[PDB]
Amino acid sequence: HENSNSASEGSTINYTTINYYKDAYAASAGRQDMSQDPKKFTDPVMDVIHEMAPPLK
Amino acid sequence: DPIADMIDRSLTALQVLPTAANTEASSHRLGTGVVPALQAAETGASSNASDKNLIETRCVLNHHSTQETAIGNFFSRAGLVSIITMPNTDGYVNWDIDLMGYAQLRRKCELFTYMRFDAEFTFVVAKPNGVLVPQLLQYMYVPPGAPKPTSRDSFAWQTATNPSVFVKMTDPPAQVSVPFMSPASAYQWFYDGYPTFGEHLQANDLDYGQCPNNMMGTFSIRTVGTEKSPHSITLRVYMRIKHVRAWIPRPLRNQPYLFKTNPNYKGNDIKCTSTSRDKITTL
Amino acid sequence: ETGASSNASDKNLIETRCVLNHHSTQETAIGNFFSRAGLVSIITMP
Amino acid sequence: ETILEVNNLKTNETTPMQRLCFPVSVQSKTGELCAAFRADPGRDGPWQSTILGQLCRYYTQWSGSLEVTFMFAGSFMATGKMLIAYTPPGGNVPADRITAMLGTHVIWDFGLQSSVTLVVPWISNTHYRAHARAGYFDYYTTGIITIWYQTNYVVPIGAPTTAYIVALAAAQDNFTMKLCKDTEDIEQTANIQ
Amino acid sequence: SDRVAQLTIGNSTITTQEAANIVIAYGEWPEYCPDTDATAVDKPTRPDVSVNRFFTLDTKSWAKDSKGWYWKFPDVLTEVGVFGQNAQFHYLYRSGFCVHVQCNASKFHQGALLVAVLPEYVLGTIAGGTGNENSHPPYATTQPGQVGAVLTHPYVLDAGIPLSQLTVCPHQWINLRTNNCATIIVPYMNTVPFDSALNHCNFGLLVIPVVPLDFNAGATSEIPITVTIAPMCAEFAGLRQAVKQ
Amino acid sequence: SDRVAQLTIGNSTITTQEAANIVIAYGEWPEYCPDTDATAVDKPTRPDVSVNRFFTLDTKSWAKDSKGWYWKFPDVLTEVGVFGQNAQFHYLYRSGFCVHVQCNASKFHQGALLVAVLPEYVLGTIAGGTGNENSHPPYATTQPGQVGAVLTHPYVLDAGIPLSQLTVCPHQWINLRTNNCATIIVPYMNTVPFDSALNHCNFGLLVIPVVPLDFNAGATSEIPITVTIAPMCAEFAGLRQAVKQ
Ligand SMILES: CCCCCCCCCCCCC/C=C/[C@H](O)[C@H](N)CO
């Protein structure tokens, strides 16, 4: 196969990349993932807050 | 177990979202105790009130894709990083690799703190008025620690180990691929501290903010022949960014840059972030 | 004196932890060390 | 293992056979130091004479642990004890023995077995290390290796009072390198032939 | 029923009766370094009681026209306690933190504080006023110690970025009509698993008064601010003689 | 095949090629204090790497007419290293020890040393010569530090007991024609499970030359003696600000 040496190998992007050489960083970018996690930036709070209840009672 | 003392959580996991979230229908509501319109911004969490909890909405199925907002599509565009001219007068230049010389790419990369990527470099070369003359050129990448060429015909130009390209002016522009080559796990654009030990004084005060995990050596071009070429040369270097992973976002800079190595700004004209108006009641 | 090199590791002299390293030895092979074009001749016709 | 050139003084340039052995003699005081050098295999100095130091010059970044083997070459009736210490960076060379014994250290005893191996373990913040140098690249420095008199060098009557010690250096099994470049030890100013 | 809170670690305990919730920065708890990411071979040392406790720094005075203050971490703790000794006798450290800021006032005062933790806070100068000098901050400005320094141009945070979007970092508010404390838990964030404590400073803690303090004449005109911090999962390696800086 | 020996603990290693066997004092290994004998309620701290290592003291000179030297434990280690810091910031400690004494000479010298560990070594005076003064030893004599003091009347050990039956304590010999080192492993021996390190001294280590050193003129007339020690299972409790003595 190819000696896999890229920047994104642990958690990677989609499997449509094209390559003709033996090193994996020569490959194209391809199309990207649609994965996202918002709640570790918009809700970094220990005790969970519900939208219905008062948050400070 | 003679000693009873010695024997002795992630918050949210990611998921894929191909399209923007839909809008579900709702009606009016009259009740006590339950209130989504009142929040508390003091806890540092953003509000979670949607559209349907404040007004009545219909049902809307939207298919708006979020593809253009990914970090891969945001960064994979070639931008100018260097202008290198050979009027220097001896037919060769040694340019230290520093990618913070032009403000349009510096502002995008300083949006994140840590970054990890592979590049792709492209060299577009012509005369200082766009004119074309048939001419042979040589590029050579010098890693840190390697000897550097001091003349147009030095022994460093034999390139027994160094990667090098030979290309003409009339040709299509050259392209290469560069892997991730830092000693650390990711590049960083900010380094709060001094690189060395020992006493810090006013003679060594310029060391503040220089991380050696980003210094990648130098870059050298020359005309191939042993004599003096009669033409002026000008090189432009463009860099793309592939396989991007980023960490820890930051506020964006709103002051104009002054140097390539430090975030110093002009202290007299502090630019206000927004364009000012006359009155608060009249737009 | 016997011409053999020593076989003492790190763990026999000090106390060590457990470290799983994934450092590849690909660049030190003789194929990658030599497969680079180098200058051998300059030939001029005056 | 190859021989390390510890005694690289300015007066030994016309008689360079003496640079491979450094002397140890009878002291009157206690706790003197006999030698000291940096443990950078890529920087110029004592490590440039090794087959490891010449092969690291063809690369840029290295990782793993080293080892330094000392071998006593005195008489049979002579004895003594030496202390070989390795100090992680942050401090300079220690002024006395009671400062230098805080780092990693091994106490050597002369006898039948005339060789001891101080292993220099890999303690660094980064996974790899570039070639250290004066300037900004001293951030990749790795420490200071000294050697001290544990006891005196005791000799009976009829045996000479000055012996020598040779030092050998090698790498451990978890050693690796990357990013091949050219060396600067060789040159070509004049044309060959 | 969540307005009261109690944090105990080590031999110390912090209690509060008007408190907001607890902020975990980027939703990650601090932890010891696993074997898959380790690079050092020496066995690390964990004091695990004498360094995992609440340390209390000095107390600033909030006036009616104050600018703001900043502390560099872990430069604030490197000369106090046994944590000041293990960071002087070693080469590498690794630790999380837990910041707690107290400032209390009565029901007749008003004001608002914005607390925020900012990683890799690199300071700058005004470049000689006219902008042609390549000035640099001195050693007393960049690493003030456990006293902390004041800000000069807080609108640009002395680093060229505006205050108006500082809340993208983990942050909380101290509004004087609801609560009196703010608390953030920060994990270890760096490109390398261990680092030196005397040449690297991970993050900066900023306390900036957005709304100015105001009261009627006759009230207690002395409003203090006190910062209390605590390391979480401290490890050390690479023993060498004591070097202070 | 048992004449060679190697002891490693911490980041230190001691090797010897002409060594006697290893002496475990009263046949007990040092260990952490179990819960059945504990009385303190606070959780103890164990540094467990930075204090369990070999520390090397100073070097004495053996002449032809020397009397003998003694070191008080753990007064010798209370100002060096991180063990010098944990014993200054705490109230209670508990640790074993491992003593190693080196003294080497050639095959043409002769002499004999008696090493011995003696617990509760209470010194005395000569009571004013004639015996009517209630004299007392000063602070510099009873706790000399990491230098160690010399003996005045070694036949009575400056405590009224004769040298002739000192071997009832754990002991070894350094005979210059066979070996060159001696090693004892001492557990923790006290009536209470923890104690202060600045007001109590557990045992004394005595090195007394029984047979005088003799050689012919021309040999190396400089015979040194070097002591190397190492704590084994050190624990600490009761944190308080630094008090040196
Ligand atoms: C024949 C190929 C020649 C081109 C060689 C290019 C290799 C150098 C790539 C450097 C990658 C970025 C490293 C650091 C970037 C910035 O200059 C620094 N962060 C400055 O702060």
The two three-digit tokens of residue D47, written as one number = 């490590």
Going from N- to C-terminal start, the domains of chain F cover: 1-245
Considering the domain delimited by B1-283, tell me its CATH architecture: Sandwich (2.60)
Show the beta-strand stretches assigned E in chain E. Answer: 5-9, 12-16, 23-24, 55-62, 69-72, 90-94, 97-102, 110-119, 149-150, 171-175, 181-186, 203-214, 223-229, 235-239
CA-to-CA dists, residue D82 to C6, D85, D155, F2, angstroms = 20, 10, 15, 22
**Element of type H or E holding C26:** none
Read off the tokens for D74: 């005195």
Q: Name chain B's partners: 3 or more CB pairs within 8 A.
A: A, C, D, E, F
- CATH number at D158 reads 2.60.120.20
- Ligand 1: centre distance to CA B98 (Å): 7
Assigned token pair, D29 = 């005081």
Which residues lie with the beta carbon below 6 Å from any ligand 1 atom? B 97-100, 119, 121, 139, 141, 163, 165, 176, 178, 187, 189, 214, 216
Which ranges of chain F does DSSP label H, i.e. alpha helix? 83-86, 139-142
- AA letter at B80: L
Burial class for E15, CB neighbours closer than 10 Å (0-12, 13-18, 19+) = exposed
- Measured between beta carbons, which residues in chain D are less than 8 angstroms from residue C9? 119, 172-173
> Whole-angstrom Cα distance, residue F42 to residue E12?
12
Is the torsion defined by CA of B152, B154, B158, B164 positive or negative?
Answer: negative
Helix or strand or coil: residue B30? coil
Residue E213 CB: number of other CB atoms within 10 A? Answer: 20
Chains D+A touching (3+ CB pairs under 8 Å): no
3-class state of residue E187 by DSSP: coil
- Angle (CA) F74-C11-F226 rounded to 5° is 35
CA dihedral B260, B266, B267, B272 (to 10 degrees): -110
Query: Which of B15, B76, B116 is nearest residue A7 as measured by Cβ atoms?
Result: B116
Closest CA to E231 of E5, E74, E115, E38: E74
Stated in angstroms to one decimal place, the resolution of this structure is: 3.6
Rounded to an integer, what distance in angstroms lies between the CA atom of residue B154 and that of residue E47? Answer: 58
E83 membership: H or E segment, kind and range: helix E83-86
Q: Is the alpha carbon torsion for F177, F181, F187, F188 positive or negative?
A: positive
Q: Which two tokens stand for residue B205?
A: 């005060």
Nearest CA-CA partner of B267 in D150, E133, F187: E133
Of B95, B99, B142, B243, the one to substitute when testing ligand 1's pocket (max ligand atoms within 8 A of C-beta) is: B99
Instruction: Give the C-alpha separation, E111 to E109, whole Å.
Output: 7
Tokens 């030895």 map to which residue? C25
Chain B residues close to C37, C-beta within 8 Å: 159
CA atoms of E74 and E83, how far apart (whole Å)? 10
What CATH fold (topology level) applies to the domain F1-245?
Answer: Jelly Rolls (2.60.120)
Q: What is the 3-state secondary structure (H, E, C) of chain D?
A: CEECCCCCCCHHHCCHHHHHCEEEECCCCCCCEEEEEECCCCCCCHHHHCHHHHHCCCCCEEECCEEEEEEECCCCCCECEEEEEEECECECCCCCHHHHCCCEEEEEECCCCCEEEEEECCCCCCCCECCCCCCCHHHHCCCEEEEEECCCCECCCCCCCEEEEEEEEEECCCCEEECCCCCCCCCCCCCCC
Distances (CA, A) of F102 to D96, F17, F105, F181, F227: 19, 12, 10, 5, 6
* Residue E22 CB neighbour total at 10 angstroms: 18
| B218 CA → ligand 1 middle, Å | 9
- Dist. CA B199–CA B201, nearest whole Å: 6
Whether the upstream peptide bond of residue F74 has omega within 30° of 0, thus cis, is: yes
CB B153 within 8 A of CB B90: no
What's the token pair of residue D113? 């077995």
Residue E224 phi, psi dihedral angles, 5° rounding:
-95, 165
Rounded to the nearest angstrom, the gap between the alpha carbon of residue B246 and the centroid of all alpha carbons in its chain is: 10
Q: For D77, which of F55, F107, F218 is closest by C-beta distance?
A: F107
User: Are E172 and E23 a contacting pair, CB within 8 Å?
Assistant: yes
Reduced DSSP (H G I as helix, E B as strand, rest coil) percent helix, strand, coil of chain E, to 5: 10, 35, 55
* Residue E86 to residue F51: CA distance in whole angstroms: 12
**Which of B185, B196, B267 is opposite residue E129, by nearest beta carbon?**
B267
> Position of tokens 């007001």?
F199
Which residues span the domain enclosing D19? 1-193
Tokens 């009740």 correspond to B31
Strand partners, E209: E113
Can you list the alpha helix ranges (DSSP code H) found in chain B? 71-75, 103-109
Are the CB atoms for E188 and E96 separated by under 8 Å? yes
Q: Which of D86, D104, D109, D122 to mutate to test the interface with F (most CBs of F within 10 A)?
A: D109
User: 3-state class of B31 per DSSP?
Assistant: coil
Judged by a CB distance cut-off of 8 A, whether residue A47 touches chain E is yes
Distance CA B47, CA B60 (A): 22
Nearest Cα residue to F114 out of F167, F187, F76: F167
Beta-bridged to residue E114, according to DSSP, are E173, E208
Start-to-end C-alpha separation, chain E? 47
The alpha-carbon gap from F47 to the nearest alpha carbon of chain E, in Å, equals 5
CA dist., res. E177 & res. E211, Å (int): 12
Collapsed DSSP state (helix, strand, coil) of residue B60: strand
> By three-state DSSP, how is residue B106 classified?
helix
Q: Tell me how crowded residue F39 is: count the other CB atoms within 10 A of its CB.
A: 9
State both tokens at D80.
Answer: 């003594």
Which contacts of B249-252 are long-range, i.e. CB under 8 A and separated by 24 or more positions? B249/B111, B249/B112, B249/B113, B249/E168, B250/B110, B250/B111, B250/B112, B250/B113, B250/E161, B250/E168, B250/E169, B251/E161, B251/E162, B251/E165, B251/E166, B251/E168, B252/B107, B252/B110, B252/B111, B252/E161, B252/E165
Question: Burial, F142: exposed, middle or buried (Cβ in 10 Å; 0-12, 13-18, 19+)?
Answer: middle
- Number of Cα atoms under 13 Å in the Cβ half of residue B132: 7
List beta partners, residue B125: B235
Q: Are strands E181-186 and E23-24 parallel, antiparallel or unpaired?
A: parallel
Give the integer Cα–Cα distance in Å for B43 and F244.
45
Query: How many other CB atoms are there within 10 angstroms of residue A33's CB atom?
Result: 16
